[PDB]
C-alpha cells in the first residue's frame, strides 16, 4: 500500500487512514522550489519534533525511517522556507 | 531477482514478473546537461522520490516499495538518463 | 508508538519508559545559532552515535537500538545547540 | 558467509559462487587511497546499470542494497578513473 | 542489544560474541574530536582486508553503516590511516 502526500507550507496534514493502524515514511523531497531557505518537516506529538531538514539546492532530498500511529492523530507540518515537500512511504499494520 | 531499467528523460516506465518491487538506487550516467533532475512515482498523484544534479549529487540510495497498482516511473528536469536499480519481492 | 525528545545542551536524558526497547531514527538540529556537536550514548562506556554542525550537516538518519531497563543515557557534547531525537518504541 | 572483493579498474568480477547459496547481497562500496581524481562508477550487468558513483576526496564510500542472482552469472565492474573499489556484502539463500 | 566500541588506530578488534545472538549489525562509524587531519578508513578483515568507510576531520566526521557480520566467522575490525579513534555503534541480532 503506497503512501504519498505533498505537504504544502501552512497546511498541516493528518494522514488519512486507508484500511492500516500505522504509516511509515521512507522519503522526503522538495519540488523545483523557489524559496532559498531551510525547511523543517515536523510531527506534532505532546510536542512538535523536527524529523528532517531540507535547504533547497544544498540538500533537496533525504531518506526517512519514521513510524507514525494514525489513531494517535499525529500531525505533519513544514516550518522553514515556504516550499512544498513530497512525503512518500507505505502503509503498515501495528 | 534483479531489477534494473535506464529511464531516458522522455520515457515513462511501467515496471510484472513477484508482487512488489523495491527501489535501491537512482544514479546518473556520464550526464551532459547540468540542471537538476527529479525521479518520480505516479500511484493517484505524482511524487518526487529524489533529486539528482550533475556534480552536486549524481546518485542516491533508495528504500521505496511499489506495488506492481500499475505504478509509473518518470524523470523530470535535465535531459539526462537515470539508472533505476533494485529487486523484486513477494508480499 | 512515536518517540521524540529535544536534548538541550548540558541536560542528560534517560529516555521515558512507555509501557521496553527504543529505536533512534533521527537526530536533527533546529535553527541553530552557535561548531560541531556530538550525540552520545553512555551504555560502562560512552560512544558517539552521530555528529552535527550548523552549516555542514543539520540532520542525519539513525538506526540505534537502546534498552530502557539498562538505563542507557543520552547527552550532547560540543557546541551548545539543541538536538531533536525522533524514533519509535518497541517491545522485547 | 562474508563476501568481500577488491574490484580493480577494468577487471570484470563474477562473484565466486558458494555451493548452497543462490544470491549475493552487496552492502558497501569504498575507495582506497585513490590516486586519480576523476569519478568512478560501479556497474552490474540484460543490461549494464550503474549501482553507485564514487570520487576521490568528494565521496569515497557509499552504502549499497543490491541483490544479485549467482546462477544468472551477473557481472560487476568499475568504469571511470583508474581506482580500485572495495565491495563488501554476504552470501544468501532465496 | 546495544554494541559500541572505540577502535584506537593501533588496535584490531574482534567483536565480543554475546551468546543467544548470532549476527552483529553495524549502524555507525563516527570520529571523536579528532586531532590528526588525514583521512582514516574503517576496515574488516577476512582472506582479505576490506574498506567499509572513509572518515576525515573537517570534511566528513561520521557516516551511517548497514553492515552484517556473522559472529561465527570471528571477523576483525581495524582502522588504517591517520592516528584517530573511531566509535563503532550498532546492535546484536539473531539469525
Numbering used by the authors:
A (entry chain C): 1 to 19, 21 to 46, 48 to 96
B (entry chain D): 1 to 15, 17 to 18, 21 to 46, 48 to 72, 74 to 96
C (entry chain E): 1 to 19, 22 to 36, 38 to 46, 48 to 96
D (entry chain A): 1 to 45, 48 to 96
E (entry chain B): 1 to 46, 48 to 96
Task: Copy the relevant paper text.
The crystal structure of PfNPM NTD was solved at 3.25 Å resolution and belonged to the P3121 space group, wherein an asymmetric unit contained five polypeptide chains. The PfNPM NTD revealed a distinct arrangement resembling a doughnut, composed of five monomers arrayed radially along a 5-fold symmetry axis, typical of a nucleoplasmin. Each monomer features eight β-strands antiparallel to one another, yielding a β-sandwich fold arranged in two sheets: sheet-1 encompasses β1, β3, β6, and β8, while sheet-2 encompasses β2, β4, β5, and β7. The β-strands exhibit a parallel orientation with respect to the 5-fold symmetry axis, wherein the β6 strand is situated in closest proximity while the β4-β5 hairpin is located at the farthest distance from the 5-fold axis. The structural analysis revealed that both the N- and C-termini ingress and egress through the distal face of the pentamer. The residues Phe2, Tyr3, Tyr92, and Tyr93 of all five monomers form aromatic corners toward the distal face of the structure. Interestingly, despite lacking an A1 acidic tract, the PfNPM NTD pentamer displays a noticeable negative charge distribution toward its distal end. This could be due to the presence of acidic residues on loops L2, L4, and L6 of the monomers exposed on the distal face of the pentamer. In contrast, the PfNPM NTD lacks a continuous acidic tract and instead has acidic residues discontinuously distributed in both the L2 and L6 loops. PfNPM lacks the AKDE and GSGP motifs and exists only as a pentamer.
Nucleoplasmin class of histone chaperones perform histone chaperoning function and participate in various developmental processes in eukaryotes. Nucleoplasmin family members hold a structurally well-conserved N-terminal core domain (NTD) followed by a few acidic tracts with varying numbers of aspartate and glutamate residues. Our structure-function analyses characterized a nucleoplasmin isoform from the human malaria parasite, hereafter termed PfNPM. To summarize, our structural and functional studies confirmed that the PfNPM is a member of the nucleoplasmin family of histone chaperones.
